[PDB]
Amino acid sequence: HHHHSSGLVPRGSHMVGLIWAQATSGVIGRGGDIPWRLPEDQAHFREITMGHTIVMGRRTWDSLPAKVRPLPGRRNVVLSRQADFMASGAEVVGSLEEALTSPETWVIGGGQVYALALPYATRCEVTEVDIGLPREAGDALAPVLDETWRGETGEWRFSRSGLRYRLYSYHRS
Ligand SMILES: NC(=O)c1ccc[n+]([C@@H]2O[C@H](COP(=O)([O-])OP(=O)(O)OC[C@H]3O[C@@H](n4cnc5c(N)ncnc54)[C@H](OP(=O)(O)O)[C@@H]3O)[C@@H](O)[C@H]2O)c1
Ligand SMILES: CCc1nc(N)nc(N)c1OCCCOc1ccccc1CCC(=O)NS(=O)(=O)N(C)C
């Protein structure tokens, strides 16, 4: 239960990580949008994901502005159960199993997909945003991590955007 894992990824393996930003309450989205824009979090998301495959749910793809998607520098994969859903510039697949063919994959949202992917994941990179944002019916929420996960929490930091935030890194075998 406490064996070490390495950060080096052999090319024959399939490392699955989750990356998300949440308010303390666990909200990650409402009404199809992320309710903040922190430049430190945006930079961090790129630094982690650049050069890898990114997997997202169909609703997260829908929420990206048409002009910015697919996100550059990364293989974009969108999960949909709809046989007629298409994503220009990206691959649409019908299962998580089909999406996880690369050696390093970052699941980048949203609520449903994080839940679905967790069982396969060995890394989570979390940004906590210190914004008063209550959970409302219909909100997209973050996954909750059990005791199989070990992690490190950074100190509270202060965004140029005027909100406090802090970074968590979690891993498991
Ligand atoms: N704060 C953050 O870090 C962050 C990051 C990303 C997104 N978000 C937020 O999350 C919100 C969306 O979350 P969400 O839960 O509503 O939707 P989502 O997870 O982004 O996408 C859900 C869609 O994924 C497809 N899907 C789900 N399970 C599948 C499966 N087993 N196999 C194949 N396809 C599957 C389905 O598409 P079909 O209906 O087409 O079949 C489903 O409707 C966004 O609006 C955004 O606000 C937040
Ligand atoms: C930057 C937002 C973010 N942060 C973390 N730590 N993890 C994530 N997975 C994450 O989501 C990025 C992908 C989803 O992005 C959106 C989803 C729904 C609505 C809007 C967005 C874009 C928000 C944004 O800040 N975009 S951006 O400028 O950073 N960039 C285009 C990706």
Catalogue the E-assigned strands of 44-159. 53-57, 75-79, 91-93, 104-107, 123-129, 140-141, 150-153, 157-158
Which residue ranges make up the annotated binding site for NADP(+)? 20-21, 28-33, 57-60, 79-82, 94, 108-113
Q: What is the largest CA-CA distance in the chain?
A: 46
Resolution in A: 1.5
Q: Which residue has the tokens 């990179």?
A: 125
Residue 61 has φ and ψ, to the nearest 5°, of: -55, -45
Q: Write out the H or E segment, with its range, that includes residue 15.
A: strand 15-23
Structural method? X-ray
What's the rounded Cα separation, in Å, for the pair 110 and 28? 8
Q: Which ligand is nearest to the CA of 109?
A: 1
